[PDB]
Amino acid sequence: IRPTIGQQMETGDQRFGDLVFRQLAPNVWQHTSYLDMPGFGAVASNGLIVRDGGRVLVVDTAWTDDQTAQILNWIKQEINLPVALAVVTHAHQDKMGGMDALHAAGIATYANALSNQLAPQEGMVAAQHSLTFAANGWVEPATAPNFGPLKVFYPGPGHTSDNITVGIDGTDIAFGGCLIKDSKAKSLGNLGDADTEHYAASARAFGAAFPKASMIVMSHSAPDSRAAITHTARMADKLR
Ligand SMILES: CC1(C)S[C@H]([C@H](NC(=O)[C@H](N)c2ccccc2)C(=O)O)N[C@H]1C(=O)O
Ligand code: NA
Ligand SMILES: [Zn+2]
Ligand SMILES: [Zn+2]
Structure with a gap:
């Protein structure tokens, strides 16, 4: 698979069905799925799979229900532990398109309340919680029970008003979703639903919430250094 948008396949990538998986840490993998756009080609989107405490936690769906079912099948084959919950990082297809497949599998789902309120208007199925x-910006603890090492942070409006981010305690990893672009990116992606006044502060707030993380994972590029945060913020500075 050679996406028009998103990172290409490199050493360390495992193809499973229509998806690609990459191990980032002993208990963390990145999932990648592709939306084939007629006349344009494929768009890659990345999420995370975390093994903690005998269970698996998923960050973001794939673009579709079938692709998300294939994620769950990869988990069964490679990890073979129950998937306890998924957190989805905003109400757009690349992050929430496969909610129905998680629900059918009995997996509890969590999203920002605002993501759930926007979901139908955005063509998405809302999370259950x-x-x-x-x-x-920090999650209210009683709304995120039994989240293991996941540290969920709302950095403010940016890519969308509802975008959230996730750090993995005890690792070098933080996940910016579609808010963060890589350090060589030329644009901030789709700004159609974005808050151009507050974007730069939201990118910097993500960086300050996860000061230690050296591996910055994002929706449409390979994991990068903290230069992705600095570059995203400087690009966003130009919008205001
Ligand atoms: C990769 C994107 C430019 S598209 C994606 C998202 N768009 C969708 O999920 C749309 N369903 C879509 C429409 C046509 C082709 C691909 C995606 C968005 O608007 O933020 N995230 C964007 C982004 O992260 O900047
Ligand atoms: Na929208
Ligand atoms: Zn989006
Ligand atoms: Zn995106």
Whole structure:
């Protein structure tokens, strides 16, 4: 698979069905799925799979229900542990397109309350549970029970008003979803639903919430250094 948008296949990538998986840490993998757009080619999107405490936690669906079912089948073959929950990082197809497949499999799903409120308007199925956030961006703990090492942070409006981010405690990894672009990116992607006034502050807030992380994982590029955060913020500075 050679995407028009998104990272290409490299050493360390395992093809499974129509998906690609890459191990990032002993208990963390990146899932990649592709949306084939007529006349344009494939768009890759990345999410995470985390093994913690005898279970698996998923960050983001694939673009489709079938692709998300294939993620669950890869988990069964390679990890063979129950998938306890999924957190999805905003109400757009690349992050929430496969909700029905998670629900059919009995997996509990979580999203920002605002993602769930926007979901139908965005063509998405809402998650079963809503996360809420303090004014400082951190998830209200009672809304995110039994999240293991996942640290869920709402950085403010940016790529969308509802975008959230996830760090993995005890690892070098933080996940910016579609908010963060890589350090060589030429644009901020689709700004159609974006908050151009607050984007730069939201990117910087993500960086400050996860100060230690050296591996920055994002929706449409390979994992990068913290230069992805700095570059995203500087690009966003130009929007205001
Ligand atoms: C890769 C994208 C430019 S498209 C994706 C998202 N768009 C979708 O999920 C749409 N369903 C879509 C429409 C046509 C082709 C591909 C995706 C968005 O608008 O943020 N995230 C964007 C982004 O992360 O900047
Ligand atoms: Na929209
Ligand atoms: Zn989006
Ligand atoms: Zn995206």
